[PDB]
Ligand binder design. Structure first.
Ligand SMILES: Nc1ncnc2c1ncn2[C@@H]1O[C@H](COP(=O)(O)OP(=O)(O)OP(=O)(O)O)[C@@H](O)[C@H]1O
Ligand SMILES: [Mn+2]
Length: 399
């Protein structure tokens, strides 16, 4: 196999993209390095799948080996990494101050805002990892219903972060709090989207009353890239509902300017540039990555393989339901049009008013529809159905 060697001076990062066909294996052979906030272990082999875009950053200097065919591979001497460090350090200062005034202390809450392709997910991951490396357990909140690092597309989700992200796999799905939105864009149902992140905020505020570490750990909140029109109001409303102390704007000066004049005076507002290592995505890439996200939910990853079950379910044993006048509940009759659609197992025992704002156990995929036998084949993470109430999602997946 073809080998590439890289010498990284202090405060430099190796930016590489895996080829379209082949895996790239990374090894740190000298010094200290990190990938999006997670420390790399010396001489450990990290295998990245095809089309992976990765930055390995070093604070003090590193030598890194790459094995395999790369699409691109170069060392960048200029990064916004110290900015993220200073943001983290400022949050930890707020923690210390509030801990010394409680005799429980509530952790600082940060809102990340900006358009698509600015590295918002990457920055959230770094900030969470740094909090973990400080000894904290932050709550990571994902409001982006298009691309979700916690659950499937069409979800508003949150996880308690107790360990640094796996270099390849990201953060562990340690009992996630997931709400089903059922659309890739908030513009499909604006009143429901607002209701869901307000419910998320209310849920978490009550959860942290039972957990001191989660409370002081604070919140890092990722938004969708919709900054124009009604999307701007969602940002202001998310900031209010989550009672954020800090708003970080990535690469959008007009949004920064507008938020500085509307947000309460106590809210610290920081504009940061996007990393030069962020590549812009097209519609095809996002659609492919959404499909890859669904596939990861059921089947897992290379390192952590999940084994989903494929079993038949009678329509008499389940209740199919759809949301959408906008927040109105609709009972679904078994049809051919439910094929390839995702369905959420609601935590509500009855298909009624409670379904709208209830979290979900998880998701299944309807693969086959047997209208003659009155059964449907579903791909499900567990052996039996966790709920009899199945909530419709407009997200389709071909498997
Ligand atoms: N400094 C960097 N060097 C190299 N690659 C990077 C860097 N930062 C981010 N990337 C890569 O760019 C891609 C997009 O990053 P990320 O998902 O954080 O952007 P985003 O704006 O949150 O995405 P979206 O546009 O879907 O909202 C990812 O594959 C990530 O690995
Ligand atoms: Mn993102």
């Amino acid at each position: 196999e073809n080998v590439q060697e890289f010498v990284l001076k202090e405060d430099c990062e190796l930016r590489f993209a895996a080829g379209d066909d082949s895996d790239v294996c990374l090894e740190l052979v000298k010094g200290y390095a990190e990938i999006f906030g997670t420390e790399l272990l010396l001489n450990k082999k990290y295998t990245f799948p095809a089309k992976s875009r990765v930055a390995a950053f070093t604070w003090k200097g590193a030598t890194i080996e790459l094995v395999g065919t790369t699409e691109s591979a170069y060392v960048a001497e200029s990064t916004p990494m110290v900015i993220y460090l200073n943001i983290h350090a400022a949050m930890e200062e707020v923690r210390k101050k509030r801990e010394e005034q409680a005799a429980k202390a509530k952790g600082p809450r940060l809102l990340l805002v900006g358009p698509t392709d600015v590295g918002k997910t990457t920055v959230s991951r770094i900030l969470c990892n740094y909090s973990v490396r400080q000894g904290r357990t932050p709550i990571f909140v994902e409001l982006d219903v298009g691309q979700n690092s916690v659950s499937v597309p069409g979800t508003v989700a949150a996880v308690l972060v107790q360990k640094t992200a796996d270099v390849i796999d990201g953060f562990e799905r340690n009992q996630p709090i997931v709400f089903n939105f059922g659309h890739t864009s908030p513009s499909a149902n604006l009143s429901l989207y607002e209701a869901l992140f307000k419910e998320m905020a209310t849920t978490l505020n009550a959860q942290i009353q039972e957990n001191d570490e989660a409370k002081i750990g604070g919140m890092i909140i990722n938004t969708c890239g919709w900054v124009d029109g009604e999307g701007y109001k969602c940002i202001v409303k998310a900031a209010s509902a989550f009672e954020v102390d800090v708003v970080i704007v990535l690469d959008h000066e007009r949004l920064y300017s507008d938020l500085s004049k509307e947000l309460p005076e106590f809210v610290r507002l920081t504009h940061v540039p996007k990393s030069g290592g962020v590549e812009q995505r097209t519609g095809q890439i996002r659609s492919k990555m959404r499909g890859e996200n669904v596939h990861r939910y059921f089947y897992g990853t290379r390192a952590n393989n999940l084994y989903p079950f494929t079993f038949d379910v009678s329509f008499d044993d389940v209740t199919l339901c759809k949301i959408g006048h906008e927040t109105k509940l609709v009972i679904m009759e078994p049809s051919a049009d439910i094929k390839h659609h995702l369905f959420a197992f609601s935590r509500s025992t009855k298909a009624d008013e409670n379904v709208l704002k209830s979290p979900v156990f998880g998701f299944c995929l309807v693969t086959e529809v047997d209208l003659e036998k009155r059964t449907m084949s579903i791909l499900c993470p567990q052996r039996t159905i966790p709920s009899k109430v199945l909530v419709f999602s407009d997200i389709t997946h071909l498997d």
